[PDB]
Design a protein around this ligand. Structure first.
Ligand SMILES: *C(=O)[C@@H](NC(=O)[C@H](N)c1ccccc1)[C@@H]1N[C@@H](C(=O)O)C(C)(C)S1
Ligand SMILES: [Co+2]
Ligand SMILES: [Co+2]
Ligand SMILES: [Co+2]
Length: 452
């Protein structure tokens, strides 16, 4: 009497299969969910329950699309539609592996990474370490990551948030990359005292140097030019505090205190990335806006669906959001090249020189945010979220890469320190090689971070 719907498959952007059903035997007919890549993108894909319906991930959030409706004899069975993700399996595989070995080499509690297409915001890779294997019983995998922290688990961003301040001082004509500043080693602001990660007297940092060296004091002085209203407006325009609508279950909205609830010290904290939280995806989406000439395209992982006949419907594109002018975006892309600039004299070196890839105008920003002590209601002194976000490349944005390390003892590559810059180096360099993207013989002249 019953005519069963055949579950749809989940494939990547080139129709490479992530999950698909085969017919088998034991009721007697029994359909088996196949996961050829095992753990590949399982944080996104999810896994099957006993009855062949989704248990978690997109298998469950898109179950109705994937499961179809059973027929009867008279009503025809509607077989499940196929879901085409924006993921590129080759990129996801490389990224997911690097993320696992960044966690191993650095001693972090977790490591995650997101790769966006610069112009379109599509999610080309989304990975975390320790990813469960959906071809195996979930109940034996309590020691595994069963979910998708890149969208579900916000953190305080620290210094990667400085893109907002930088975008606001440029867009509002309030400063320029080459402006020579005078930056003390500390200031009192909003009732509190803010210090730079190194002690120094008044330093002739350019605006380029404030972000390339990640001066908190410098960021805040430039932020006083913007004011709370214009800065809070730029936060909101950058997408923070609000879900992206990427199409993944369990997405968090993060957390931005609204301006009418600020305390006297909120403005002293937000421009340096403390006092607010965001997801890795929101973090990478901020850099997507800048990569896309100031136009933010909310990220999306569902590319299209194919009906049982074979007809394809593309997913509807989200509307553009104008965060900053194209001129502003280009100027911020170029400033951020200072973060990867190397200088043996130290003077004109940014915080993330290991992130540069020679022959390419790489551009990014490091961060080191303090985590909250759960048994205190106060910040740890030596527990951090490490964070990197970058664009490949400044002069021709193709890829946006966002990385977070949960409190590593070492670099992502195992060298001493605490930086995520080596992992951006690995992934961005590999993305350029595999597309045979051409080098550039001249990098331009070095950027000036520090005047006289
Ligand atoms: C942004 O991430 C800033 N970090 C801080 O002010 C932290 N409170 C801090 C953590 C650890 C040591 C010193 C300060 C600046 N950006 C960092 C980075 O770009 O990696 C920094 C360590 C240069 S300070
Ligand atoms: Co009927
Ligand atoms: Co240390
Ligand atoms: Co290298």
């Amino acid at each position: 009497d019953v005519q069963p719907a055949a579950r749809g498959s989940i494939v990547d952007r080139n129709n490479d299969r992530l999950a698909f059903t085969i017919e088998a035997r034991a009721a007697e007919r029994q359909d088996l969910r196949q996961y050829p890549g095992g753990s590949l993108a399982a944080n996104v894909v999810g896994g099957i329950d006993w009855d062949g319906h989704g248990l978690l991930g997109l298998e469950d959030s898109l179950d109705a699309v994937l499961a179809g409706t059973d027929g009867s004899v008279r009503h025809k069975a509607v077989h499940g539609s196929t879901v085409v993700l924006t993921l590129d399996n080759d990129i996801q595989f490389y990224v997911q592996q690097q993320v696992q070995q960044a966690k191993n080499l650095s001693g972090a509690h977790n490591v995650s990474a997101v790769v966006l297409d610069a112009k379109t915001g599509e999610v080309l890779a989304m990975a975390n370490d320790n990813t469960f294997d959906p071809s195996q019983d979930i109940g034996r995998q309590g020691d595994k990551q069963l979910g998708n922290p890149a969208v579900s688990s916000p953190f305080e961003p620290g210094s990667v948030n400085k893109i907002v301040a930088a975008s606001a001082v440029i867009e509002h004509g309030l400063s320029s990359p080459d402006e020579v500043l005078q930056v003390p080693g500390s200031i009192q602001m909003g009732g509190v005292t803010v210090h730079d990660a190194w002690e120094h007297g008044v330093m002739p940092y350019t605006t380029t140097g404030v972000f390339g060296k990640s001066s908190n004091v410098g960021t805040l002085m430039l932020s006083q030019r913007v004011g709370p209203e214009r800065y809070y407006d730029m936060l909101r325009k950058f997408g923070l505090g609000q879900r992206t609508g990427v199409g993944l279950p369990g997405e968090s909205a993060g957390l931005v205190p609204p301006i009418d609830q600020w305390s006297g010290s909120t403005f002293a904290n937000l421009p340096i990335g403390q006092g607010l939280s965001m997801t890795l995806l929101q973090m990478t989406g901020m850099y997507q806006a800048i990569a896309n000439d100031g136009v933010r395209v909310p990220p999306r992982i569902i590319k299209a669906t194919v009906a049982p006949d074979g007809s394809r419907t593309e997913e509807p594109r989200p509307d553009d959001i104008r965060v900053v002018s194209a001129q502003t975006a280009q100027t911020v892309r170029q400033m951020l090249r200072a973060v990867v600039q190397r200088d043996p004299m130290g003077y004109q070196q940014g915080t993330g020189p290991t992130a540069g890839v020679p022959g390419y105008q790489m551009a990014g920003k490091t961060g080191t945010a303090q985590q909250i002590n759960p048994g205190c209601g106060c910040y740890f002194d030596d527990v951090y979220w490490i964070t990197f976000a970058g664009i490949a490349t400044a002069d021709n944005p193709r890829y946006v890469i966002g990385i977070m390390l949960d409190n590593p003892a070492r670099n992502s590559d195992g060298a001493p320190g605490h930086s995520a810059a080596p992992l951006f180096h690995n992934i961005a360099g590999w993305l350029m090689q595999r597309e045979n993207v051409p080098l550039s013989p001249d990098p331009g002249p070095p950027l000036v971070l520090q005047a006289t």
